[PDB]
Every structure is written in structure tokens, then in C-alpha cells.
Amino acid sequence: KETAAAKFERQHMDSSTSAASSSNYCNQMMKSRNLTKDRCKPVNTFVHESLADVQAVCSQKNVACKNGQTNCYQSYSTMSITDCRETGSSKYPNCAYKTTQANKHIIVACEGNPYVPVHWDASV
């Protein structure tokens, strides 16, 4: 089984690009990160910053998680991100996503030792 930290990395990290430069970015990334294997993940956000920068968020601003937990942290600075969301023309196995690039503060839940991101809460 995948560790929580490893799953977060696979689902949300894309430091190889500064930003989504194409409307097909999500279709490509959702497939390659294996998020459309047995069903199309409805929603998923990728962050375009170094892994170190994202991990560093765990020692930044502590804010409440949407679920009420208190182990969430909000990035001090905005980060380049790309939100991927299924379009009305999406139907497994032919998943289809809308690609929305933006620069926003990230909010993640952190846990463990080392204390790292294990869940994507939201972006602002």
C-alpha cells in the first residue's frame, strides 16, 4: 500500500512545469498519475512548485481543515497550481478534464515524522 505522503506526492505534485501550458494538461496528467485507472477521479489539483516548497508549508500558517481538524497549513505565498475537473463529456474509460491554471495559496493537512503533506484541503 502507498504511504499517505507518497500518495499526496503522486496526486498533487508536478514540479516539472512552471504551469499548465495546454488545455490538455489535465487529460494527460490525470492519466499518467493513474487517477483514471478504474474510474475518473472527479477533481484533482496539481502544484507547480518544488517538493521542498510544498513540504515547507507544514511549518507555515496553521489553519482549520474543512473537516474541522487542526493539522492544516496555508502557504504564506501563492503557488502555481492547476485544477483538473471532469467535464460533462467525461465518461470512463474516456475521462475528460477541464484544465484551470492559477496562482493561489495552498492548504494541506500534515502528519507524521517527518511532518509532511498527506492531504490536499483547498486553495485560496
Side-chain angles (χ1 to χ4, degrees), residues 35-55:
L35 302 172
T36 69
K37 279 277 159 111
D38 273 330
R39 67 230 359 232
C40 316
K41 187 163 189 242
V43 181
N44 189 253
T45 308
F46 289 103
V47 184
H48 305 118
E49 303 296 347
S50 69
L51 179 55
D53 274 6
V54 173
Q55 293 173 325

Side-chain angles (χ1 to χ4, degrees), residues 1-110:
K1 220 244 172 226
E2 204 175 23
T3 67
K7 176 164 194 203
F8 174 96
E9 285 163 359
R10 174 178 59 88
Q11 299 197 305
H12 308 297
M13 293 301 311
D14 182 10
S15 320
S16 74
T17 56
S18 51
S21 276
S22 147
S23 57
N24 289 324
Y25 170 92
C26 284
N27 282 350
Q28 174 255 133
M29 289 298 165
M30 292 301 287
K31 182 199 69 61
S32 67
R33 288 305 176 89
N34 297 327
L35 302 172
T36 69
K37 279 277 159 111
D38 273 330
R39 67 230 359 232
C40 316
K41 187 163 189 242
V43 181
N44 189 253
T45 308
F46 289 103
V47 184
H48 305 118
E49 303 296 347
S50 69
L51 179 55
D53 274 6
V54 173
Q55 293 173 325
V57 175
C58 293
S59 60
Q60 292 179 195
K61 192 68 167 198
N62 183 37
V63 299
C65 297
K66 269 152 47 237
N67 73 350
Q69 282 195 258
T70 65
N71 64 142
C72 278
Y73 296 75
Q74 178 163 146
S75 209
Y76 289 148
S77 181
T78 57
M79 292 178 172
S80 169
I81 65 94
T82 298
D83 198 41
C84 296
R85 293 180 91 105
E86 272 193 287
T87 63
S89 295
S90 188
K91 218 66 174 306
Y92 177 88
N94 307 118
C95 305
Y97 297 85
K98 160 178 165 67
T99 296
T100 304
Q101 162 73 211
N103 291 85
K104 276 75 214 165
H105 300 270
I106 287 65
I107 301 172
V108 296
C110 303

